[PDB]
Structure formats: C-alpha cells, structure tokens
Structure 1
C-alpha cells in the first residue's frame, strides 16, 4: 500500500512479460505478440507462423 509497487515500471524489461508464462527475458514484441521466444516456438503454428524456407 505504502511502497509496494512504488517503483515505476512503465518501460524496460520489467514493464512487459510473456502472456503465456510471465517471462521478461527473450520476449518477442514484434507485431504486438508479447510471447517469449521459447513459447513462440511451441505456439508458432497456432499463431499462424510456418516454416517455409
């Protein structure tokens, strides 16, 4: 209440997190994805991204 989230996290690594697992590092935020690069490889066919070349 007093100082619990008193630090500004409007920007940086700690502002955002993966929507699947809440991981600040290794995230992709291209095209507004906000999934880490380890979960994007799992879900990438469900998103629509396919290995073509």
Structure 2
C-alpha cells in the first residue's frame, strides 16, 4: 500500500551497502566480499589475507 517511499536502487553507490556497518564510502566490489576498506584491515587476518611483500 505504498506507491511512494520507493526509488530505483539497482545501480550506483546507494544500490548496495557494506555488510559490516552499512557504509557507502570505500567499499570493495571485488571478489564478492563487500567489506569497506576501513573494516577490511581489521578482519584481513580472519579471511586469510596476510602481508608477505
């Protein structure tokens, strides 16, 4: 019962959100992980990304 209140959100930055804190800035679309770049570093050791070089 809501013709209003909706907008096309199939593309762009507002189409999706980070699965950590719903942030729209600095998000990673690569490899299907959808982690923002500030929270990716705190959980990089948990995923398996390490610093060799």
TM bucket normalised to smaller:
0.7 to 0.9
Going from structure 1 to structure 2, the CA distance change for 1:41 and 1:14 (only over 3 Å counts) comes to same
The answer for unaligned runs of 5 or more in structure 1 is none
Going from structure 1 to structure 2, the CA distance change for 1:23 and 1:3 (only over 3 Å counts) comes to farther
Tell me the CA shift for residue 5 of structure 1. 4.0
Structure with greater helix percent:
1
Task: Give the length in aligned residue pairs.
Answer: 53
Tell me the CA shift for residue 6 of structure 1. 1.4
The answer for unaligned runs of 5 or more in structure 2 is none
TM-score, with structure 2 as normaliser: 0.87
Tell me the CA shift for residue 4 of structure 1. 5.1
Structure with greater strand percent:
1
Runs of 4+ in 1 over 6 A off after TM superposition: none
